[PDB]
């Protein structure tokens, strides 16, 4: 297969994403959830890890680490400490609202993923660090976890398999940096949600100093489907090292802002013109696309014509896949004001721990706040580039990376627009 997309509804993992069916247990059992979960639990962790490593499932959090290889780091005998699956359900990323849809409309799929993945990693229980702003989604998830307990699917002797497994939900408290896995661990442990340094990677020292795997809602919820349908079924969609299906949030300047499941290596133009109703004013009215949520650098219309929506084709296009959240920006957009607002986000959402992010993201906000009006001279553009290169790679977590990258994308694709902004400021003010 060389042309991807046009995914059939029989191949969607996330049936009942739109809330058009019962999200509860009688709805989920009439759609395919909780079917032969015991026969996945009783085939050991090794078969489940083989099915997930075969399926090519990479991290749906946004970095795309191989989820089976990540979960095989827990395949080790215990040292007296328990093991924990922790489901990252924060989703504070701008553009990204898909895990809200998964928790709100397929909760039992996430709970069965918690059970199966925790069997695969030998986990004691599952702490779902849900977002604090997703309150109704959290009570939604707790009602479905109550329905899974009362049916004996989780808890003492989960699904009749001799295996004990609890599912905990910890609400957030309004911090974007608590989506980062070590800061999420610190937020579960009742401290300031500040990211730890790595190593120890959380399979060595994680939550409470236990072995821990933090995994996204999407890469957990697809795991019973990977166990039932098979690894070859999931690897049969998308390119090699770019396997599976993926939820997409197309928002911004489109005619129909939507959440939709789609095949992995789908073209961006096909995705926007099919599921989103096109860009407002047509495809010819396109100026830029932030391809994968706010941290990934933007791409212009000359790149958006033939680009694909997976990891490798966006890394080749000097951006990233990220959360695969498409923020569409038409020709009427002040792009400098939008990216400066995005850097204003990344300094309002920054935990202040280490020097380059704490100082330089505020200093990039100040430089971008002068770039919006144009109250600067062009020797500060390249300067700003160097400042991004002094934050990219020198921080603890990748919010310094996620704050340096949109500045780099705006400079790299719209340096002449910044220069004409500043020179028209300098001519109508001096």
């Amino acid at each position: 297969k060389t042309s991807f997309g046009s995914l059939k509804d029989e191949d969607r993992i996330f049936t009942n994403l739109y809330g058009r069916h019962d999200w509860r247990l009688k709805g989920a059992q009439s759609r395919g959830d909780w079917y032969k979960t015991k026969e996945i639990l009783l085939k050991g962790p090794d078969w489940i890890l083989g099915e997930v490593k075969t399926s090519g499932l990479r991290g749906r959090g946004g970095a795309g680490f191989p989820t089976g290889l990540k979960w095989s780091f827990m395949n080790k005998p215990s040292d007296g400490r328990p093991k924990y699956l922790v489901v990252n359900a924060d989703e504070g990323e701008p553009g990204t609202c898909k895990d809200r849809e998964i928790i709100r409309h397929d909760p039992h799929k996430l709970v069965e993923g918690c059970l199966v993945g925790g069997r695969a990693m030998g986990a004691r229980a599952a702490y779902i660090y849900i977002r604090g702003e997703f309150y109704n989604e959290a009570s939604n998830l707790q009602v479905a976890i109550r329905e899974a307990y009362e049916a004996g699917l989780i808890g003492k002797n989960a699904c009749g398999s001799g295996y004990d497994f609890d599912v905990f939900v910890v609400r957030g408290a309004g911090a974007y940096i608590c989506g980062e896995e070590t800061a999420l661990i610190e937020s579960i442990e009742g401290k300031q949600g500040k990211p730890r340094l790595k190593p120890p990677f959380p399979a060595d020292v994680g939550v409470f100093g236990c072995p821990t795997t933090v995994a996204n809602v999407e890469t957990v919820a697809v795991s019973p489907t990977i166990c039932r349908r098979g690894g070859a079924w999931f690897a049969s969609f998308g390119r090699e090292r770019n396997s599976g299906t993926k939820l997409f949030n197309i928002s911004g300047h489109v005619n129909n802002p939507c959440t939709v499941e789609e095949e992995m290596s789908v073209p961006l133009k096909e995705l926007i013109e099919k599921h989103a109703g096109g860009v407002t004013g047509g495809w010819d009215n396109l100026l830029a696309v932030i391809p994968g949520g706010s941290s990934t650098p933007l791409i212009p219309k000359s790149v958006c014509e033939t680009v694909l929506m997976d990891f490798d084709a966006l890394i080749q296009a000097q951006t990233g896949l990220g959360t695969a959240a498409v923020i569409v920006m038409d020709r009427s957009t002040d792009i400098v004001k939008a990216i400066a607002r995005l850097i204003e986000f990344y300094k309002h959402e920054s935990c202040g721990q280490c020097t380059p992010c704490r100082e330089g993201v505020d200093w990039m906000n100040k430089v971008m706040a002068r770039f919006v009006r144009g109250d600067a001279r062009p020797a500060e553009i390249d300067s700003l580039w160097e400042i991004s290169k002094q934050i990219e790679g020198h921080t603890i977590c990748a919010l310094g990376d996620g704050a340096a990258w949109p500045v780099q994308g705006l400079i790299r694709h719209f340096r002449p627009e910044l220069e004409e902004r500043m020179q028209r400021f300098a001519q109508q003010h001096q």
Partner: protein, 55 residues
């Protein structure tokens, strides 16, 4: 420069040189004691980019 041309001619004859052309006492030809404020230039490292000190 206030000497009489008799004394000036005697002085030029005695030295053998023209002395009013090259006077050693200074007059209004010298620079003013009050000058306009300067604007001094900066060096090559007064840049905002490609200015790493290790380089």
């Amino acid at each position: 420069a206030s000497a009489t041309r008799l004394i000036q001619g005697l002085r030029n004859w005695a030295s053998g040189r023209d002395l009013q052309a090259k006077l050693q006492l200074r007059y209004q030809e010298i620079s003013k004691r009050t000058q306009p404020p300067p604007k001094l230039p900066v060096g090559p490292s007064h840049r905002l980019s490609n200015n790493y000190y290790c380089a």
